[PDB]
Write a protein that binds this ligand. Sequence first.
Ligand code: HEM
Length: 184
Amino acid sequence: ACTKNAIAQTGFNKDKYFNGDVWYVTDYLALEPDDVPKRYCAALAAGTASGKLKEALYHYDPKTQDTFYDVSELQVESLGKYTANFKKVDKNGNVKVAVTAGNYYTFTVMYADDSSALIHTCLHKGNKDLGDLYAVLNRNKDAAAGDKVKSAVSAATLEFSKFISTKENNCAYDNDSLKSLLTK
Ligand code: HEM
């Protein structure tokens, strides 16, 4: 179960975040710990495509090799706070699992600048829900979390020390597929 009403960044700059580029997850915190594996790789692209607000997601479990992509259109609840109805696709945008009622995530940008961000997401997916999940993002897949984003983690009354890093997983991404999935 999700439990947090995450607060969006004051003065969030939507066009800069949703610029069509890629964000890498460098660290994550699942509130229900056995909710997700202890080793993971995830990234997204976020942009407007033909007037529509979009995200493309990539998940990879580096131990099992489980891999999946998703595309969503985001609807706006308030500045920096969205509800997204996802379709599972291959890397080329071919639909594997269509959009359906009940399959959605919420997405809140708690902090962002040109290079880093802190987000919250709540996944709803039939009998495969996840609880609250926070992620530190960077434009550079190898960047250690800096002071701006770590201060934002503190300001959210979270302990960065509890976040799990993705950096020791040999994560390798297909940026081209994430960018082109925005259109799909
Ligand atoms: C970056 C922000 C993230 C968003 C918006 C997000 C969103 C999603 C969505 C929409 C799905 C379902 C996809 C489908 O069935 O087609 C999913 C599944 C999953 N995600 Fe994430 N995710 C993110 C990051 C992460 C991270 C960092 C982890 C763990 C390190 C993670 C772990 C999982 C797992 C294990 C599943 C499959 C299990 C399930 O569907 O219940 N995700 N995620």
